[PDB]
Each structure stands twice: as C-alpha cells, then as structure tokens.
C-alpha cells in the first residue's frame, strides 16, 4: 500500500506514535517519507547482507527475522514480512521499541540526515487529525 501523507499521519496517530518518546507526528511522517516514500512494501538490501523492511525500513540485523541475516537478532519478535503489511500495526509496535533503544529517532539515518532539525510540522500541515 502506498499511503497519502495525511492518510499515514492519521494511521500513525491511531496506533499511538504521535508524540511517542517525544517525537511529534511530523517526525514520523517525515521518516516514513524518506525511508519508504510511504510504500508499505519497500525492501532494501544492506551491504552487510541485512535487509530493511517496510514503511520505516526496519533492519533484519536487529529487529525482525528474515532467515537470511547471519547472526542477527529479532528483537521485535516478528517475521520481517509482517513489516510489509498494508496495516501498519507491526511496523509501529517495532518502531516503538527502536526509538526506545537509547538514540531516539537517530536509529533512522534518513531521519537524522533529512528530517532532524527541519520544519517537520509541514508533513502534517492541513491534515484533519
Ligand atoms: Cl508527500
Ligand atoms: Cl509535527
Ligand atoms: Cl536470520
Ligand atoms: Cl519468523
Ligand atoms: Cl493501518
Ligand atoms: Cl530522544
Ligand atoms: Cl486530511
């Protein structure tokens, strides 16, 4: 599923991400924008043999099981395929654990490089919500 910007904002809020660990909804929308372009089925291979999955590009190195990332953990206790669902519940639940892990949203390198410090409220501008 490819979400609209306000559509995704609404789904994130509905799943309790809005202001989770102090990160406003715009931060999360901006992160999803640069990680997946709002596409739930986005997958990208890392040079180290791990893969990033879904709307927020969660890495198999730590967070989910894809059965092909030697020595990886599955800290969200989830198949990586569950992160590609049109329903964002799994991705959100896992993102909650990632953002709680000590470095906040810096865990998303695209967020640090393209969202951090910017006018992130633009992302939710005009959205009913
Ligand atoms: Cl957009
Ligand atoms: Cl915001
Ligand atoms: Cl594995
Ligand atoms: Cl699994
Ligand atoms: Cl959803
Ligand atoms: Cl923080
Ligand atoms: Cl709207």
UniProtKB/Swiss-Prot annotation:
Broad class of enzyme this protein falls into: hydrolase
GO annotations of cellular component type: cytoplasm; endoplasmic reticulum; extracellular space
Classification of source organism: Eukaryota, Metazoa, Chordata, Craniata, Vertebrata
Major location (coarse): secreted
GO-annotated biological processes: cell wall macromolecule catabolic process; defense response to bacterium; defense response to Gram-negative bacterium; defense response to Gram-positive bacterium; killing of cells of another organism
Extra remark: Lysozyme C is capable of both hydrolysis and transglycosylation; it also shows a slight esterase activity. It acts rapidly on both peptide-substituted and unsubstituted peptidoglycan, and slowly on chitin oligosaccharides.
EC number: 3.2.1.17
Natural source organism: Gallus gallus
GN (gene name): LYZ
Name recorded for this polypeptide: Lysozyme C
Catalytic function, reaction form: Hydrolysis of (1->4)-beta-linkages between N-acetylmuramic acid and N-acetyl-D-glucosamine residues in a peptidoglycan and between N-acetyl-D-glucosamine residues in chitodextrins
